[PDB]
Every structure is written in C-alpha cells, then in structure tokens.
Amino acid sequence: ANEVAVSYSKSLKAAEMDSLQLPVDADGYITIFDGKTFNGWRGYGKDRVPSKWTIEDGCIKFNGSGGGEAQDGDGGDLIFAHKFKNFELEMEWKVSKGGNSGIFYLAQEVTSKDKDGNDVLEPIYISAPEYQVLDNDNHPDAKLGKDNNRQSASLYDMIPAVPQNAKPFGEWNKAKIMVYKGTVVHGQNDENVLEYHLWTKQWTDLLQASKFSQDKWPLAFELLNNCGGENHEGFIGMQDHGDDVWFRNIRVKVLD
Amino acid sequence: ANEVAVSYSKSLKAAEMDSLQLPVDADGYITIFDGKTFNGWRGYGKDRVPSKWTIEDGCIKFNGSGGGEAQDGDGGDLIFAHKFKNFELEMEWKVSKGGNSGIFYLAQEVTSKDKDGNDVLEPIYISAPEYQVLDNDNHPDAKLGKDNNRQSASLYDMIPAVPQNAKPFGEWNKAKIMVYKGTVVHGQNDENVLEYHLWTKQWTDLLQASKFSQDKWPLAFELLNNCGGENHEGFIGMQDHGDDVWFRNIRVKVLD
Numbered sequence: 001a002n003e004v005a006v007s008y009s010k011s012l013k014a015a016e017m018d019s020l021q022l023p024v025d026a027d028g029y030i031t032i033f034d035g036k037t038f039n040g041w042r043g044y045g046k047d048r049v050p051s052k053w054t055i056e057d058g059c060i061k062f063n064g065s066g067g068g069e070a071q072d073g074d075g076g077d078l079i080f081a082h083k084f085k086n087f088e089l090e091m092e093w094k095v096s097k098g099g100n101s102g103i104f105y106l107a108q109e110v111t112s113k114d115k116d117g118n119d120v121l122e123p124i125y126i127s128a129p130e131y132q133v134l135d136n137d138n139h140p141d142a143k144l145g146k147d148n149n150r151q152s153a154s155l156y157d158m159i160p161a162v163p164q165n166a167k168p169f170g171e172w173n174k175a176k177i178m179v180y181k182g183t184v185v186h187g188q189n190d191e192n193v194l195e196y197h198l199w200t201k202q203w204t205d206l207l208q209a210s211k212f213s214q215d216k217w218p219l220a221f222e223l224l225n226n227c228g229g230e231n232h233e234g235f236i237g238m239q240d241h242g243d244d245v246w247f248r249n250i251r252v253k254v255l256d
Numbered sequence: 257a258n259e260v261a262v263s264y265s266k267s268l269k270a271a272e273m274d275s276l277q278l279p280v281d282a283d284g285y286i287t288i289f290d291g292k293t294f295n296g297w298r299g300y301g302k303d304r305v306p307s308k309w310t311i312e313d314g315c316i317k318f319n320g321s322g323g324g325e326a327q328d329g330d331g332g333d334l335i336f337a338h339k340f341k342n343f344e345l346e347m348e349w350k351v352s353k354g355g356n357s358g359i360f361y362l363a364q365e366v367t368s369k370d371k372d373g374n375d376v377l378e379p380i381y382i383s384a385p386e387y388q389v390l391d392n393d394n395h396p397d398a399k400l401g402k403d404n405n406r407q408s409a410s411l412y413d414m415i416p417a418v419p420q421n422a423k424p425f426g427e428w429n430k431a432k433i434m435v436y437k438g439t440v441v442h443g444q445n446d447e448n449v450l451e452y453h454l455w456t457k458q459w460t461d462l463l464q465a466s467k468f469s470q471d472k473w474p475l476a477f478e479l480l481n482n483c484g485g486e487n488h489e490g491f492i493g494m495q496d497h498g499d500d501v502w503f504r505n506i507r508v509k510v511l512d
C-alpha cells in the first residue's frame with residue numbers, strides 16, 4: 001500500500017525491463033524523484049543522466065551555460081524513463097532570470113534516417129507537447145507566438161495559459177499536467193489554465209497554426225498529430241534550454 | 257542611468273581596451289550611432305573608417321561606386337567594434353534604386369594563411385549572418401536564390417523573410433535583429449519575419465544547404481556552424497555592396 005513497482009528503461013528505445021519501488025501516497029501520487037538520486041531518470045536518447053543535471057537541496061537542477069536550444073556541453077533533455085498513458089503530474093518549478101525550460105509529456109524517443117542511412121536523434125519537442133517554463137517578464141519568447149502562447153504553462157506555441165498567474169523569476173510555481181483518455185489540462189499555481197483534447201480535429205487545427213505544422217515541420221506534425229504513438233503513451237521530462245532551472249516535489253498519479 | 261560604458265576595439269582583432277559613454281534610454285537601448293561621429297566604428301579588418309563611409313544628414317552613409325562585391329576604392333564593410341552576445345539591434349535603413357547592402361551580426365574578424373604563410377583577411381560574411389538590405393523590386397538578386405531568400409530582411413540565401421513587407425527604394429525600413437541565447441529573430445517594419453536557432457542540427461542543416469556548406473566552403477562552414485566563436489559573440493556591422501545606402505537610429509539593447 002505504501003510503495004508501488006514502477007518499470008523503467010535504461011537506454012534509447014529499450015524495454016522497461018527493470019522496476020523501482022517508489023513511494024505512493026493515500027491518493028495514488030507516486031513520488032518519482034526521491035530528492036537524492038536519479039533512479040529511473042536518464043537523458044532523452046541516452047543511457048545516463050547528463051552531468052549538467054544535478055541534485056541540489058532536494059531538487060533536480062539543470063546547470064545552464066546560456067545557448068538556448070544548442071544543448072552544448074554534457075546536456076540534453078531529461079526524462080523519467082517510464083511511459084505513462086493516463087496520469088496526473090504535479091511538480092514545482094523555478095526558473096532563473098531570463099530563463100527558459102519546459103515540462104514535456106507523452107514524449108517518444110525518435111530517430112530519423114539521413115541521406116546516407118545514419119540515425120539522427122530528433123528533438124523531444126517534435127513528439128512531446130510542452131508545458132512551457134519561462135521568465136515571462138525577461139525572456140523574449142514571452143512576446144513571440146500569439147496571444148502569449150509561449151508564456152509559462154502554455155501548450156507551447158498553441159494554447160496560452162489563461163489566467164497567466166505565474167510568479168516571477170526565482171520564485172516557485174506549481175505545475176499540473178493531466179492527461180486522461182485524450183483530455184489534457186495544464187494547471188499553474190493551483191488554477192486550471194487550459195484544456196484541450198488530443199487526436200481530434202481541434203488538435204490537428206492547433207498543430208497546423210503552430211511551428212509544428214505539416215508545412216513547416218512535416219515529421220513534427222506526424223508525430224504530434226498521433227501524439228504518444230500507436231499506444232498513446234510516453235515519457236514525462238524536462239528541457240535543457242541552456243538556463244538554470246529547478247524542479248522539485250515531482251509526483252505522478254496513474255489514472256489508467 | 258542616462259549613460260553606459262561601452263567598450264570598443266581600435267584595430268584588427270584587438271582587445272576592447274577603451275570605452276565610450278553612450279546614452280541609454282529607459283528601455284535599455286544604447287544609442288551606438290550619435291548622428292555626428294564614427295566613435296567606436298571602424299572598417300572590418302581596419303583601424304579607421306573607410307572614406308566611402310560618411311555621415312550625411314544624421315545617417316551613416318555608404319557612397320557606392322557600383323561594383324557590387326568588388327569593394328573597390330576605399331570601401332569595405334563597417335563594424336561597430338563592440339562584441340555583443342545577447343542583444344536586440346534596431347536600426348533604420350534606406351537604399352538607392354536597385355541598391356544592395358546588409359546588416360551583419362555576430363561577426364568575427366578572421367584571417368587565414370596563404371600557401372606562403374602570409375595573412376589573408378577573410379570576408380565578414382563567412383562568419384557573420386547577414387540580414388539582407390535590398391531594393392526587392394529592382395536588384396536582380398531579389399529573383400535569385402530560393403523562395404525569395406535573398407530579399408530584404410532574409411537571412412541571406414538561407415531563410416526568407418515572411419511576410420516580405422519591405423518599403424520600396426528611397427523609403428525608410430525598420431530592421432530588428434534579436435539574438436537571445438541562440439534564438440534569432442529578424443524583424444522588418446514592426447513584424448517578425450523569421451526565427452531560427454543557432455548551434456542546433458537545424459542550423460547545421462541550413463548551412464549544409466547553403467553556399468557556406470561544408471563541401472563548398474569549409475572555413476565558412478566551421479565559423480558559421482559555431483557562430484560567434486567560442487564565446488558566441490561578435491560585431492554588428494553593415495555591408496559595402498557597392499551601392500548608396502543610409503542607416504540611422506542605430507540602437508542596441510543588451511538583453512542578458
């Protein structure tokens with residue numbers, strides 16, 4: 001009753017052939033970060049946690065060197081290597097001034113083939129919807145997109161958080177991501193800030209008005225349009241966008 | 257809080273060992289061209305302003321002889337000799353009928369060695385992304401390239417400005433170049449006309465499709481693929497492409 005087995009994979013596209021015994025509370029939230037280890041976590045596309053991700057004061061910290069999407073040094077996005085389907089995630093996040101990160105969900109590890117048959121690891125964000133994490137006051141992306149749909153807790157580049165009730169940089173915010181049989185809800189600071197439905201005509205329309213449109217990014221469109229792949233499942237994770245960011249109290253309830 | 261110290265270099269590859277006190281407005285834009293002097297400005301590769309650059313009715317003016325890329329006489333590209341990293345440049349430009357120039361950013365002063373060990377000054381454009389400045393209606397380069405990627409406000413011969421909202425020749429156009437932690441946005445006439453991300457696989461892909469591909473121009477590939485060199489910073493400047501062009505209201509906000 002106090003712990004549950006949680007399967008996890010150890011490397012790119014591998015089976016979940018190991019399990020962790022993780023604490024669960026009376027309401028079914030599984031604590032997936034223990035404050036001390038990266039057990040069950042690995043870099044997206046990797047068999048290890050990049051050293052730029054550290055543990056400090058009971059938090060997961062990304063130690064950013066400032067290159068945005070570049071993911072220079074020993075970086076890359078971080079996943080908890082258990083595919084979830086119907087789930088409610090809660091975590092606290094805090095961004096540095098002018099900082100950018102994100103919470104990914106239903107992510108798939110995706111490769112493509114180059115002209116010579118070599119693999120190319122594709123970005124997590126071309127399969128995974130992103131709950132934006134941002135300093136809404138200082139990061140210029142805050143003013144891009146449309147109707148503030150690149151500010152914190154937005155579905156990045158598609159649906160704005162309303163209300164935009166973020167606390168300013170260097171202050172803790174609470175995130176909720178709920179996916180239940182295609183219904184998706186983002187929460188910020190104990191309010192619901194958007195709601196949408198995967199795999200619908202509305203979902204296709206959102207994609208087509210975004211940077212992941214069929215015309216702008218065909219592979220992104222195809223992955224996202226059938227988000228979670230054949231079995232409508234995938235990873236939670238957090239973004240290396242080159243900036244200091246902290247995450248804590250990371251818990252997930254299986255709704256399935 | 258009316259003025260800020262801005263360091264600048266006096267000659268090829270030198271340290272920024274001197275500073276100007278330059279006005280800053282309440283939004284944090286530094287006025288880097290004072291309407292009267294070339295303080296802090298020098299030719300690319302030079303320790304002086306080339307005499308073909310003049311100050312005319314509160315503008316920086318290039319006085320073109322009509323020889324395109326030749327840079328004949330006392331010409332050459334012009335830089336403001338302060339390396340910027342995370343910044344937003346705004347400036348206004350106007351061209352002569354059929355005129356062509358460009359706004360460079362993140363530029364490095366690069367030399368190579370010839371077969372005998374002498375120096376060769378390499379063009380600014382093998383290190384510096386170029387925001388195209390053009391008479392889109394009369395200069396034939398507007399019809400060259402792919403999908404209008406050589407028209408004004410494009411990332412020259414790589415990403416077209418969309419929309420193409422230039423004002424015609426003899427009229428002032430407003431340019432915006434923002435570089436923030438690798439995110440690049442070009443604006444033209446108060447619209448954002450393209451976005452990209454430096455130092456990503458998408459950036460590499462753009463280069464490999466261009467005249468600066470690894471196959472076609474290895475040195476340019478090396479420089480642009482790691483644009484800004486090891487500290488990801490470099491100069492703003494403007495192009496000698498042999499044609500009369502005017503620039504004014506040149507202002508830069510340091511973002512980080």
Ligand SMILES: [K+]
Nearest residue numbers: 038039040041
């Ligand atoms: K681990």
Ligand SMILES: [K+]
Nearest residue numbers: 100101102133
């Ligand atoms: K983000």
Ligand SMILES: [K+]
Nearest residue numbers: 294295296297
């Ligand atoms: K000077």
Ligand SMILES: [K+]
Nearest residue numbers: 356357358389
């Ligand atoms: K040009």
